[model samples]
Target: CQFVCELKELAPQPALLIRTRTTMSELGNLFVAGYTDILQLLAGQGVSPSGPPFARYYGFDMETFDVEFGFPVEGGVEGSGRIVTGLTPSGKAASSLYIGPYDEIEAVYDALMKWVKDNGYELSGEAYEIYLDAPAETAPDQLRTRVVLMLHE
Candidate 1:
C-alpha cells in the first residue's frame, strides 16, 4: 500500500444524481462541467448539500464509464432533466483515503478490493469515490479521495 485504509459506515441520505457516460479521458471533463452545472441548479432552488459530491460507478467497458455524480440533498428533492432523485445507498462500507494523483488512485482501490475479500465481506457492486479536496486547490500528494463500497458481511 500506497494509502491508508479506514472503515466507513454510511447512512441513508436523500440526493439528486446526474447520470452520465464518458471515456476515461473525459471523466475529468464531466466533473468540471457537471459539478458547477448541478450546483447552480440546486442553489437556484435553495438546496444545500447534506454530504459531499460522489460518483456512483455503474459500468465500464474500457472505453466508456457509466456514472452518476451528485450531492446528497437533505431530505431529498424533486428532479428535472438528467438529475434523478434518490437516496444515497446506506450500509457498512470499506473505505480508504488515497492521497495522490488521480491517475495513481487505482492502487488504493485494488487494496480496498483485496481487503473486502480477505475480510469475508461482499461488495454491493456500486462504489463511491468521494473527493475530499479540489484538485486545483491542492497538490497531487495532498489530494484526498475517500474510496467507499457498501458491504455485506
Candidate 2:
C-alpha cells in the first residue's frame, strides 16, 4: 500500500455539483452519470473546470453515502435542474494520497483518521476525495485520489 498522509491548508473552491444519497453498489454508476451530466452542463454554459474532478462526502457508512460529485470551476458556471453551484469548504485538513483501486481506499481513510486522533485534532465530520487522475485514461491500480478530512476550527 503506497499511501501518504499530511495536513494542509485549503482555500475555498467554487464548483458545480449534484448531490445524492447512494449505496456503495450504486456509487460507481452515480459518478459516471453525475460527471457526464456535470460536464454537459458545463459545456452548455461554456465553462471549464479549473482543476481535477472531486467527490465530497458529508457522511459515509457501509450502507449509505451522502455525497456530491462535481468539478472545481473558475466561478462563472450555473447549473440547471438537479445540478447546482457551491463552494468546497476551506480550512485546515488531514489529507492523504491513496494510489490504487477506489475500493481499497478505505484503509487510507482509516489511517488518516487514526493519524488525526493520534495528533489530537478534532474533525468536522466532512471529507473530500479529489480525483487527480482520470479513470478513463488510467488503470484502476494507478488511480490517484487525494482524500481530505476537514478539521474542526
Candidate 3:
C-alpha cells in the first residue's frame, strides 16, 4: 500500500551528487559506470550513506536530460571530480510511491503530478525518485520507488 497524494515537510539533507545531462536510456549505464567512483570519493571523505541513492530532476529531454544523481550522506563532505556537495532540500512536497517495474512506473508519477495540479499546487521544478529496493535482489514487479514533487509551498 502507498500514499497517492500527501504533503511532506522535509529538512535539508547533505548528499554527494553528480550533475549529468543524459538520456532516459543512458541513466542506467551512467549510474553503473559512475556509482563506484562516487562511493569511493565519499568513503575517502569518511561520509557514509544514510539513505538509498536518488535522482533529482532538473530538466528532461528524450535524447538528453539533466539530473543530479545523489546519495544521502550521514555528514557533510567536500566533493571531487564530477561529484559535488549539495543539500537535498527543505520544503513541503506532494509525494507518493510506486511498487513495480521502473519501465511501468511512469503512470505513478503522472498520477502524482495530476493530483498536485488538481489540488492547485505549484511545482518547484525539482523532483526526486528514490529507489527503495534493489532490482537484482527483488523481482521487477516488486521494485519500490518513492516519487516526490517539490512544492512551492
Candidate 4:
C-alpha cells in the first residue's frame, strides 16, 4: 500500500525559468536569473517585504530541461514565462532529509535511488531537492537538504 495524502490548492508566487547544462558556471547564470526575477516579482506583488523567501519550481520536465518557478499559496497566479503557473498533480513522493555540506548531497541521492530500485518504485518525475533554508542561516555542518523522490506505483 502507498501513503495517500489529501490534495490542496497551492498559491502562486513569482519565479524565474532556468536552463541547466553540463557546465556549473553556465547553469549558475540561469539560477541567478531565475532567483532574481522571482524576488523582483514577489516584491512587486507586495506579498512580503522580507528578503529571501522560499521558492519552488513545479511542473518541470527533465527530458526537455524546463520547469516553472513560484511558491505555493492559495489563489495565487502569475504570468506565463520562465516562472511557474497553477498547481499540477505530483501524484506521490517518497521523501528523505539530509543535513550537512552541499557536496555530500550525492551520497544521499545515491542512497535514495538505490532504495527506490530495491523497492520497485518507478520514477515519475525529476528528482526534487528542496532547499528548506539558506546556507547562510545554518552552519556548515547544519545545512538543511530536502530530497524528494516522485514515484509511481
Highest lDDT model number? 2
On TM-score, who's better, 2 or 4? Answer: 2
lDDT score, candidate 2, position 54: 91
Which residue pairs clash in candidate 3? none
What TM-score, over all chains together, does every model reach? Answer: 0.86, 0.92, 0.88, 0.64
Q: How high a TM-score does candidate 3 get? A: 0.88
Ranking by TM-score: 2, 3, 1, 4
The regions of model 4 sitting more than 4 angstroms off are 1-23, 48-69, 84-89
- Angstrom error at residue 56, model 4: 8.0
Clashes of each: 0, 0, 0, 4
Residue lDDT tens for model 4, 1-153: 124221122222332333333332343355556666766766687654222323223344443344433344334545445555444325566567777776676767677777777777766755555566667568968877666666765
lDDT of 2 by residue, 1-153 (tens): 224677889998999888889887898888989999989988887888998889888876768879988898986677899889988878999988988998899978899998988889989988899999998889998999999999997
Q: Over the stretch 1-153, how does candidate 1's per-residue lDDT look in tens digits?
A: 234666678887777777888777888988888787778888889877776788878676767778888887876468778778876667888888888998998888889999888777888777788877889798999998888877874
Backbone clashes counted, model 2? 0
The worst-scoring run of ten residues by lDDT in candidate 3 lies at 1-10
Give the lowest summed-lDDT range of ten residues in model 1: 1-10
What Cα-based lDDT does every candidate model obtain? 0.80, 0.87, 0.80, 0.52
Candidate 2 runs further than 4 Å off: 1-3
List residue ranges in candidate 1 displaced over 4 A. 1-3
